[PDB]
């Protein structure tokens, strides 16, 4: 990616619709600002699990995860972003999308699957090896079953950051 300025003054930012930005960790929490449309193509390509490099017009690349975007309520457009500089120990408590695989046999007799938790925040994902999704097979599930966090399988070096008993995806009956 690319970004340039970071003045405390914002009057330049609004005109070219470039998003405001920051990058921080323990040592340096310096603020910045970058182009909008390329940022949105990138944030589409990767969410809170995806990461990208920023090349501030200073000559050194940095590797950033995305941590929070706070944007306009009226206009749908994103307003501000907070990238997070990350050391290659496991990134803290990253969120992972839930996604369902298979045609559940509960769907075939009047039920429908419902993902009660669209994101699951796992600790110690392991940076650069982050889970960009999380497939859960629902075919075993029948109407009224609950696939909790004590089911969802995990890759390397990962441990769920949420209570295992909590409901995740559940098949639901008609009406």
């Amino acid at each position: 990616m690319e970004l340039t300025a970071k003045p405390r003054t914002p009057k330049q930012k609004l005109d070219e619709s470039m998003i405001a930005a920051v990058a921080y960790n323990k040592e340096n929490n310096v603020s910045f600002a970058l182009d909008r449309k390329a940022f949105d193509r990138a944030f589409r390509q990767q969410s809170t699990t995806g990461l990208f490099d920023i090349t501030v017009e200073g000559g050194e690349t940095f590797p950033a995860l995305v941590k929070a975007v706070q944007m306009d309520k009226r206009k749908r457009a994103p307003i501000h972003v907070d990238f997070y500089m990350v050391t290659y120990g496991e990134p803290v408590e990253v969120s992972v999308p839930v996604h369902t695989t298979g045609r559940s046999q509960g769907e075939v007799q009047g039920g429908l699957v419902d993902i009660v938790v669209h994101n699951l925040q796992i600790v110690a994902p392991g940076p650069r090896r982050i889970p960009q999704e999380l497939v859960v097979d629902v075919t075993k599930m029948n109407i009224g079953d609950h696939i909790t966090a004590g089911d969802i399988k995990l890759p390397e070096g990962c441990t769920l950051a949420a209570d295992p008993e909590l409901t995740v995806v559940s098949v639901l009956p008609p009406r």
Partner: protein, 136 residues
């Protein structure tokens, strides 16, 4: 619809909403653009329309709720005793506030269902699928 609760009557003004700009439940969501009161039967008509179009299937959430009492003085009197005891319950609604959001229905059918429901709301409104989201 009507709440089972507390003090009968209130007041009124406005500012852009905060308590639900993002679609947590479900897939898609219709969303308000104007600051009107919504109140009771307006919602319930939205509900009954979408439940016709979708039911036997889908999940319907109504994130808005007729909190605020509104009053009508009787008939035809002069500015008289006090305010008027009853009339209808409303929900204030500011732009970016999410009123509706379907689950388990194809994109196009959610389009048509949001269209029907929004043809009977005082405000114009825009639908969206959920972008990337945070706030947990």
């Amino acid at each position: 619809k009507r709440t089972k609760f507390r003090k009968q009557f209130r007041g009124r003004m406005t500012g852009d909403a905060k308590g639900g700009d993002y679609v947590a439940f479900g897939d898609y969501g219709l969303i308000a653009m104007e600051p009107a009161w919504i109140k009771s039967n307006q919602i319930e008509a939205c509900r009954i329309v979408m439940s016709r179009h979708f039911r036997r299937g889908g999940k319907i959430y109504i994130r808005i709720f007729p909190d605020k009492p509104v009053t009508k003085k009787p008939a035809e009197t002069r500015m008289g005793k006090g305010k008027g005891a009853v009339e209808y319950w409303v929900s204030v609604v500011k732009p970016g506030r999410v009123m509706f959001e379907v689950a388990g229905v194809t994109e196009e059918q959610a389009k048509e269902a949001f269209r029907l429901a929004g043809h009977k709301l005082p405000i114009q409104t825009k639908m969206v699928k959920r972008e990337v989201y945070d706030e947990a």
